[PDB]
Design a protein around this ligand. Structure first.
Ligand code: NAG
Ligand code: NAG
Ligand code: NAG
Ligand code: NAG
Ligand code: NAG
Ligand code: NAG
Ligand code: NAG
Ligand code: NAG
Ligand code: CA
Ligand code: CA
Lengths: 594, 328, 594, 328
């Protein structure tokens, strides 16, 4: 009998190994907390943030159950704004410390189990770059590193070869008196676009990627992908106003950009970036993440960066939606969620971010009442929640100050220093005359004040990430949204074998009442709440038919049943899942077939 | 002659415990320097113990020591031989299914049924040199490849570090048929066990130069992660050889009784809860053996009393001190 | 000693297996002989060629050392010309036999060691197709199988949504009175373009590919790849003449086609076609070939179909060059060869074809004197030589006849029936009033006459394919071209370890003399000829300094030396190879390292 | 009893000649029907031969027949045992390096040195049941998998077809210690050899339903091409099992002499020039053995004279017609 029982065990183990799904990578589980390196924490007492200040506050990052950091671009740049025109990719600016300060930051990050991500701008460079200074003199192989074209430039004014306009001004062809030819920049006067059609240039970007990968940056995040390649035929773009007179079109909005954005072969360059990073992802635990971050485009063009089922391009593109939305309601939020889940290919991992560097703050664009409900929506979605720095608490925008450095007046309100304490400059730096004035109402909004008091908008961010990390329904579960409303958004998170669902209700309306008996069938007379967007009514009792919800109010209901909506014939076109799996309570393991 | 005895001593000492011990010995010392110091202390302690056994076993030839003898006979049938028989099978199970789960640790259900299947297999085979050769290859490869890229809590570190030195108490039993034990058996131990100690130190520094200190904690099989970070193209030879040699290192009523009660030892205990469970009773009787000789020894006694009073286990005193005393 | 000698043998065998390169596939070695199914051979005595007639003449195909057939599109088509508008992809027309006649043809081809290739047109369909007849009524899933757009069509004429013109006429948007909407065709009034943005349509093409792959067609050959996808934004194309008045542009030449050719995602559809055929290529000897056949475009766009080093797209695109060349000289032929070898990525297999269906004959475009020299150029190049039917001999064009069927007046001169015998209709068919009049001078030009007489332009095609198949220098060897001339084209074929080179000299001039001592160094006082395009003179003696060459004259010189040009520092930028390998005379095996 | 004898007879008959014979037996018949007819004829011929040996070997117990005996002793030392020992090694070489060369056939140099290395290896191992079990698995898999998808020149076909039936002349030597040979040895042959014959026919039709007739000629190893066209995901088990069992089917001075002169047999002869070289001398002495018994029969004689006069090489007439005539 034992001789049969010994193989029945080996057959059981080989079945578990064959039925166990692939474990979620570090970029799939755990939220991200995007940090601005200049407005997070200062250590050397100079006025600007540094990489050492992020290492000192590393214990606070783990307190929020954060997995990845995604530090914003920190390079030796002559232009700190406008897509971060870099003049030296291998070196770091005098600010943010030195190369040794960066090596100590990534090492301390790996000791606490965290992951790092750095921004990468392969599209353009700076005017002070060693490649551009050697291109104007036609020195060696660098003579064709940029898009150069012969243009006429007489006594008074330059004439571009075409009407191609830059995103931040006029005349995206500028003339220089050294090379006597116009160069294509498309972003700014001091940001020449790096010609990617040169096989030498495409290989030079590989050396920059491998340089940081050996340091252990644990992935990259491309900034401008759709501006890489342009049309070889320097033809004029189609104007939006056909009757418009030429010599007047100077705005990037009044022009159809069909020859300077998303050209043939642009994705193949993105496909080659993943192939280079794949050489460093051979380790079982050391996987490399790659983000495209293509903003200001339609939904069908964003989902193309996910790749094809037979060729890998990128893990996921950064979800620009939910950030440009100024006025939120039941229909605007529902349209954004369905636009991403319906256009994304199946088996991919979505993502969501409420705010970012080039966007207004949450409480300044939506309001202080929507800070709690938007944080729950970020953690109750199947995608990887991405959080901006200072977004876990309610940090308002600041007025535009006149800085001597070349910085964008707009989109600078989000670069305010992090409010740590209630001391001078909100504890961001012990020095005076900081690079940006700290927000005025920092004595009432800071990490130290919100930690000591209950019912604050800091504990809600803590237990949401804890609920997202501990519970398996939020990590890898189905997403079944219920119809469409203008005063409430309700969706259900479920998984096979759990015998328990999560009902998330977000108001986004005007203090209306919800009847849960009209949306989901089979709910009991009383249901319990888990977290709320108020932290004061958790573990309470509410009946389904009639629920009192305020403006900024959100609830999570935990019901025990084996009547999952994803199994019913009605909820088949409104249920999405990335990794379809089945849970087993008896044998605590993950199953593919069930 | 002498070199043959030295090779035989080295062969029965270097077991499947050098690539399982560091993970548990660093979780108690929480450092690198103290870890190597504890390893050297364990090595010199095993050396002194083997040198004392070489003079205690060749003068009385259970055989080294009434009631105490009966207790030893009773303990070696339940908590000594079957427990150590289950630890070897648990170590083989956690190493043959480790490469399958790269990103995350293996399930507890999978490793137990696979260990139980390994127990029933060898118990059936036994009821009816290639492992050593392949075992020394991995130890040589890791050391060689490691050099081409180089140029309360203190008691648990000893328990996990001394598990790699498994077989130092049974050296005189298989070395009295080679040559004269006058100056050959003590000579093959004073330079044979420290040779393994230096071999273990050179093997442990090969891990710290490839993976950092914090990566060693979240790694059940430290050898399979060293095999893909250095030998990337040929990375399947490390988890295969250390598993093919581990299963080799692991009387009909005696084997059946040693395989039945060993299966109930892996259900409520993990691979870490059994090393401190076997080394507790083992070193308890080791100290009584040294104490019996008195009635090297000045150090063997002061270090054995510390290994017992520092943890002071509750599920162990009711099996060896209560189980048979009701029977006797 | 023997115990050491036994492992020294195993170490030798494991070294040979590890150093042996990958064997050339069936599409890399052996020439192709493209056959027109309607003008090759008739069996049932009806007037038109059939697939049974190709089976009867299969022994002649093997006599030319031909590897692949590449039969031109033979489907149930309502339009036999203009890109072969098919109305039924699963069935065969009444002509060319039935489905059983095709199954007996492919089976007889595999018995003689030959390979088959069929043409595939996934771009468009016919008006009588079951998909188009079901699309005009909006019946089920077929309502969006074509590009439909709402257009105005009042009493007198239709108005297209844009100025997109077809390749063969005006107004590539036509109106139908059933669906009351304009459909996009881009080729002809009865050739609606199949909308590929529909996931259902892209999967329906997979079922058509798998249908013929189970029959054993041994690969496909796509017809129109650059016309698959179009721009979703129905915007007007840029006119070549800016001052041109609208309502007059009706020619495909006077319009820049930037929205209807080579759109974003077109290659991804081609990448998916290879992934479907890869499921049938798992066998070691049964490999599937895929050709793109993108004509009328630049060289940088043609080489993009070769694929990337990390994703396979196609084996090779069909080389449209060397066919549009009407006047051949030393510079026109040299530019074509260098344009393909310099733009093609390394490790790929090139190709060459002198003529085709949509091109004039060789002797009618170049002359009867250039028939022999162009056949040598096809077999002395590293690519896969592709030969049109009737091209091995000198077959002239015919005058345009008025046929009752819808056929193109131009490009029909190449569809003349094959001249087999000197009997009625040149032995093509025993019936009268054939579909196309056989060329008049068939009593002097036929396979039977050219076989019995020596010094003909049929034996030169036979021993050229024999020399290309037997010798390894022509199969897989280096290609080092010498400088540039207007009256002779000289290149050298060599390989490491052969200790022997092949010097090919083609005149393409006006009866000039060549001094071989000025081009290649190290040649002896006397050199022997191998084929000498004109016959007879083979195995003769000619000194290097002074060689008499006529207009249509070509020679192959075989010199024995270890002074390969590809090893010298001067001939480093003019030497190309696909599979770099070394030959060994002692051990007759292929080596990678040498 | 009877089933044990039948299994023993089947085991010593099904050798490494069923997946090497079809390629050479189809190149002479050039068809499928005649191929199966020739296979059935070879099977019934081997059956009749074994049935006759079962009555000729149990009545005279070289032993069946002076000069003829001496010739048999001399032939079994050069052209019978060493030649068959080289064919088994050549079949193992052409099957272990076949998956490496998918598109094209392997080089002649690689297969000869690999076969010579296989000869020297087993000759050294032998100078100092698992093969049969794995051999019957492939024969069972090909037959079973073949059914789930189903529902001058004449003398060389016999030579290649009878090589698969290798061991029918040594059946009474290992079957006289089982039971009474009264009605057990002839009974286990009249239904044991035809069972292998039907097994060979069911195995040959499994090739013609997957690959066509013309593909069998350009295929040195017909089993490795059948393993990838049917069992595409698991296609390495066919070239591994038939090679692991072939090396098993293949006295210090006797082994060395059988391995030295066998290496000089593969240099000037291919795998096709040795089958007609061994079957010529083998069947020449087989006919003399049947003729010795005489000194069904009307057909056995007319078919045996045809098998000898049809082939009637330069390196053979100086060994059988010149070697002993200088000795006699
Ligand atoms: C939208 C935009 O920036 N247009 C710029 C304008 O700002 C600038 O004043 C002018 C000269 O500098 O060239 C143009
Ligand atoms: C300027 C200011 O706000 N200081 C307060 C201090 O009064 C208070 O004791 C401390 C504890 O929360 O936090 C801070
Ligand atoms: C209750 C509600 O908001 N229903 C809306 C409906 O008004 C709208 O017409 C439809 C189209 O988006 O989506 C849903
Ligand atoms: C009409 C015609 O040309 N008939 C000729 C015939 O005279 C000749 O005998 C035969 C042999 O080549 O070929 C044909
Ligand atoms: C832009 O379009 C509008 C037509 O709606 C019209 O003002 C004109 O065509 C354009 N504006 C100017 C200033 O030309
Ligand atoms: C455009 O339409 C008219 C009407 O049929 C036709 O005569 C003309 O041929 C078309 N233009 C071309 C280039 O075919
Ligand atoms: C086409 O271009 C030429 C200018 O070279 C000029 O005739 C005109 O702009 C265009 N022709 C017509 C008929 O408009
Ligand atoms: C060779 O090519 C160059 C440019 O294509 C041309 O200027 C030159 O005249 C050519 N030389 C000969 C001998 O044709
Ligand atoms: Ca660019
Ligand atoms: Ca189309």
């Amino acid at each position: 009998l034992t001789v049969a029982s010994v193989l029945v065990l080996i057959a059981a183990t080989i079945a578990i190994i064959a039925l166990s799904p692939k474990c979620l990578d570090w970029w799939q589980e755990g939220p991200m907390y995007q940090i601005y390196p200049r407005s997070f924490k200062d250590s050397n007492k100079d006025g600007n943030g540094d990489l050492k200040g992020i290492q000192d506050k590393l214990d606070y990052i783990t307190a929020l159950n954060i997995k990845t950091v995604w530090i914003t671009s920190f390079y030796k740049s002559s232009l700190k704004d406008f897509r971060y025109g870099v003049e030296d990719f291998r070196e770091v600016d005098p600010i943010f410390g030195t190369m040794e300060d960066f090596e100590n930051l990534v090492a301390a990050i790996h000791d606490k189990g965290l992951k790092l991500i750095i921004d990468f701008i392969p599209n353009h460079t700076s005017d002070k770059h060693i490649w551009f200074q050697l291109s104007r003199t036609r020195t060696g192989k660098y003579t064709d590193y940029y898009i150069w074209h012969d243009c006429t430039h007489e006594n008074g004014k330059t004439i571009p070869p075409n009407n191609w306009l830059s995103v931040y001004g006029n005349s995206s062809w500028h003339f220089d008196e050294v090379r006597n030819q116009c160069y294509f920049h498309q972003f700014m006067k001091e940001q020449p676009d790096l010609n990617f059609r040169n096989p030498d240039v495409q290989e030079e970007i590989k050396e920059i990627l491998r340089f940081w990968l050996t340091k252990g940056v644990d992935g990259f995040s491309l900034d401008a992908v759709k501006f890489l390649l342009e049309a070889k035929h320097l033809r004029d773009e189609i104007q939006v106003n056909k009757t418009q007179i030429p010599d007047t079109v100077t705005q990037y909005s009044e022009l159809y950009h069909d020859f300077t954005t998303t050209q043939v072969g642009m994705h193949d360059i993105v496909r080659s970036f993943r192939q280079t990073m794949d050489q460093y992802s051979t380790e079982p635990g050391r996987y490399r993440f790659m983000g495209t971050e293509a903003y200001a485009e339609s939904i069908d063009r964003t989902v193309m960066y996910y790749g094809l089922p037979f060729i890998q391009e990128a893990d996921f593109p950064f979800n620009n939606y939910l950030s440009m939305l100024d006025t939120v309601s039941g229909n605007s939020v529902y349209e954004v969620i369905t636009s991403w889940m319906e256009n994304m290919p199946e088996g991919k991992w979505p993502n969501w971010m409420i705010g970012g560097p080039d966007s207004s703050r949450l409480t300044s664009r939506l309001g202080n009442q929507y800070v709690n409900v938007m944080n729950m929506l970020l953690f109750t979605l199947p995608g990887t929640p991405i959080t901006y720095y200072g977004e876990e608490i309610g940090m308002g925008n600041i007025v535009a100050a006149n800085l001597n450095e070349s910085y964008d007046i707009n989109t600078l309100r989000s670069k305010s220093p992090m409010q740590w304490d209630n001391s001078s400059n909100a504890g961001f730096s012990e020095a005076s005359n900081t690079w940006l004035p700290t927000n005025s109402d920092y004595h009432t909004v800071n990490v130290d004040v919100q930690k000591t008091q209950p019912r604050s908008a800091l504990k809600l961010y803590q237990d949401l990430s804890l609920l997202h990390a501990n519970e398996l329904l939020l990590n890898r579960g189905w997403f079944c949204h219920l119809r469409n409303d203008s005063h409430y958004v309700v969706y259900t998170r479920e998984l096979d074998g759990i015998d328990r669902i999560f009902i998330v209700v977000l108001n986004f309306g005007e203090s209306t009442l919800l009847n849960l008996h009209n949306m989901i069938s089979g709910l009991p007379a009383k249901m319990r709440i888990r977290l709320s967007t108020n932290s004061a009514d958790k573990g309470s009792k509410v009946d389904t038919s009639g629920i009192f919800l305020d403006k900024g109010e959100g609830l999570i209901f935990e019901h025990n049943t084996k009547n999952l909506l994803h199994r019913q014939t009605a909820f088949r076109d409104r249920c999405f899942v990335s990794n379809r799996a089945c849970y087993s309570s008896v044998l605590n393991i993950l199953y593919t077939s069930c | 002659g002498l070199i043959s005895g030295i090779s035989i001593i080295v062969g029965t000492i270097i077991g499947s415990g050098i690539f399982v011990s560091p993970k548990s010995v660093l979780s108690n010392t929480e450092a690198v320097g103290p870890c190597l110091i504890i390893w050297a202390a364990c090595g010199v302690l095993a050396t002194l113990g083997a040198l004392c056994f070489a003079e205690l076993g060749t003068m009385i030839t259970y055989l080294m020591e009434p009631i105490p003898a009966y207790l030893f006979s009773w303990a070696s049938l339940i908590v000594i031989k079957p427990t150590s028989f289950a630890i070897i099978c648990l170590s083989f199970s956690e190493y043959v299914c480790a490469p399958f789960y790269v990103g995350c640790k293996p399930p507890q259900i999978v490793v137990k049924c696979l260990a139980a299947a390994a127990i029933l297999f060898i118990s059936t085979v036994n009821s009816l040199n290639i492992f050593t050769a392949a075992k020394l290859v991995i130890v040589a490869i890791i050391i060689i490849s490691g050099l081409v890229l180089l140029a309360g809590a203190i008691s648990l570190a000893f328990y996990n570090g001394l598990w790699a030195y498994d077989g130092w108490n049974q050296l005189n039993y298989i070395t009295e048929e080679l040559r004269n034990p006058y100056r050959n058996l003590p000579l093959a131990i004073i330079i044979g066990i420290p040779l393994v100690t230096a071999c273990y130190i050179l093997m442990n520094v090969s891990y710290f130069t490839v993976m950092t200190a914090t990566e060693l904690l979240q790694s059940q099989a430290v050898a399979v992660t060293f095999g893909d970070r250095v030998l990337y193209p040929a990375s399947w030879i490390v988890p295969l050889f250390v598993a093919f040699s581990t299963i080799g290192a692991a009387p009909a009523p005696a084997i059946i009784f040693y395989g039945i009660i060993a299966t109930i030892y892996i259900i409520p205990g993990d691979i870490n809860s059994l090393v401190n469970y076997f080394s507790f009773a083992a070193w308890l009787f080791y100290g009584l053996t040294i104490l019996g000789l008195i009635v090297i020894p000045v150090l063997m006694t002061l270090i054995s009393v510390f290994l017992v009073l520092a943890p002071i286990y509750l599920y162990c005193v009711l099996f060896i001190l209560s189980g048979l005393l009701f029977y006797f």
